[PDB]
Amino acid sequence: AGVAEFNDKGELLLPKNYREWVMVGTQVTPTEIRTVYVDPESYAHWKKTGEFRDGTVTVKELVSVGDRKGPNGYFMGDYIGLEASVKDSQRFANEPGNWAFYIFYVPDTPLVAAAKNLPTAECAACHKENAKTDMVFTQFYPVLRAAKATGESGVVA
Amino acid sequence: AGVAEFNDKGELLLPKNYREWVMVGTQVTPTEIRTVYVDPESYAHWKKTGEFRDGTVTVKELVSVGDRKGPNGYFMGDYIGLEASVKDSQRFANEPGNWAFYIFYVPDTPLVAAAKNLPTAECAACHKENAKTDMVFTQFYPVLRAAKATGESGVVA
Numbered sequence: 001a002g003v004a005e006f007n008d009k010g011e012l013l014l015p016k017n018y019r020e021w022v023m024v025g026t027q028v029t030p031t032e033i034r035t036v037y038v039d040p041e042s043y044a045h046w047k048k049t050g051e052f053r054d055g056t057v058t059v060k061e062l063v064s065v066g067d068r069k070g071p072n073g074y075f076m077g078d079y080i081g082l083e084a085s086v087k088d089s090q091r092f093a094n095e096p097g098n099w100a101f102y103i104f105y106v107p108d109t110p111l112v113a114a115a116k117n118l119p120t121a122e123c124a125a126c127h128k129e130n131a132k133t134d135m136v137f138t139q140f141y142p143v144l145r146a147a148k149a150t151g152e153s154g155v156v157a
Numbered sequence: 158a159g160v161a162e163f164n165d166k167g168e169l170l171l172p173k174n175y176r177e178w179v180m181v182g183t184q185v186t187p188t189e190i191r192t193v194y195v196d197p198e199s200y201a202h203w204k205k206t207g208e209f210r211d212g213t214v215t216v217k218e219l220v221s222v223g224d225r226k227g228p229n230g231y232f233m234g235d236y237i238g239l240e241a242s243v244k245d246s247q248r249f250a251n252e253p254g255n256w257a258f259y260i261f262y263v264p265d266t267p268l269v270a271a272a273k274n275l276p277t278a279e280c281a282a283c284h285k286e287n288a289k290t291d292m293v294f295t296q297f298y299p300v301l302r303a304a305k306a307t308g309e310s311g312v313v314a
């Protein structure tokens with residue numbers, strides 16, 4: 001259905017060019033910035049329906065923080081991690097909300113080309129317990145809010 | 158050439174669906190988060206050349222900061238401002254680097270549907286004095302760095 005690619009053993013392959021996807025929110029930990037992307041076709045469907053289609057892929061990219069002085073602030077430093085989630089009613093028929101969760105790398109677990117779906121206690125439990133909308137933390141993603149509430153991807157006069 | 162649209166009097170119209178463009182960096186002021194977008198065709202050209210094509214449009218979107226407690230962090234709150242820049246060797250033949258700068262709204266100047274190019278002392282002066290690359294602060298935008306240095310829009314194994 002969606003953009004997710006899996007190898008023969010069912011592991012999720014590193015999404016390609018996900019930084020060209022739709023950035024839906026950015027968060028800061030008071031040390032790290034996190035950037036969240038939704039693949040463009042799933043975002044288009046969201047705009048029309050306020051729902052995550054079957055096949056939806058999200059990516060959370062982790063960065064350290066750079067310090068700017070003049071001409072003061074913080075900015076995205078080095079890439080230090082990458083997580084993803086994939087919704088698939090068929091492939092993940094037996095997972096909560098049909099979502100699978102993945103780590104490609106974090107402060108040292110080295111990068112893998114392909115990732116295995118993680119146990120529910122590790123990832124899905126928190127999401128299904130706390131996320132506003134279908135196991136995604138849309139309460140923190142104002143791009144999605146404006147898209148769902150108004151069909152827009154930007155301010156309109 | 159590019160995606161910029163101008164009205165009859167030469168004012169820049171609010172870009173449409175710019176939140177679907179390529180987010181190249183996010184910055185935090187220690188109070189505000191700023192999100193920076195480059196239109197997809199100009200980003201594609203950047204990937205191939207490490208240069209900003211004639212017609213390049215950038216957008217800087219300003220947000221207040223929300224506070225997350227559990228299950229601690231900061232996230233993008235309310236939209237509070239929007240600036241843009243446009244490179245055009247023909248239309249802005251007489252501007253530094255051929256870039257024009259714009260405010261659509263900020264903490265109260267109300268939103269305009271169309272914006273007039275701002276004086277160089279107000280905007281272009283700082284950019285041309287301090288920005289790393291052709292009046293854009295690419296020193297702070299790691300998406301562009303990885304795209305220029307490696308042709309990639311994401312981590313590759």
Ligand code: HEC
Binds near residue numbers: 083122127131227228
């Ligand atoms: C962000 C996240 C995302 C982005 C998409 C989404 O579902 O919102 C993914 C793909 C992911 N994480 Fe999850 N996570 C939590 C919260 C509050 C946010 C948004 C706020 C922010 O980024 O600052 C998330 C919450 C939690 C959590 C609470 C105790 C747990 C244990 C996890 N997340 C665990 C995981 C994963 C296990 C390694 C994993 C692959 C995640 N999250 C993916």
Ligand code: HEC
Binds near residue numbers: 071191283
């Ligand atoms: C960010 C900005 C952007 C994003 C594209 C880019 O050229 O990098 C635009 C379109 C824009 N501003 Fe500029 N600005 C400055 C810096 C350091 C950054 C990136 C870091 C961050 O966001 O935290 C910018 C610097 C300055 C500055 C230094 C004294 C001045 C006076 C300005 N900027 C002024 C303006 C504008 C006048 C109202 C205007 C429309 C801008 N910037 C647009």
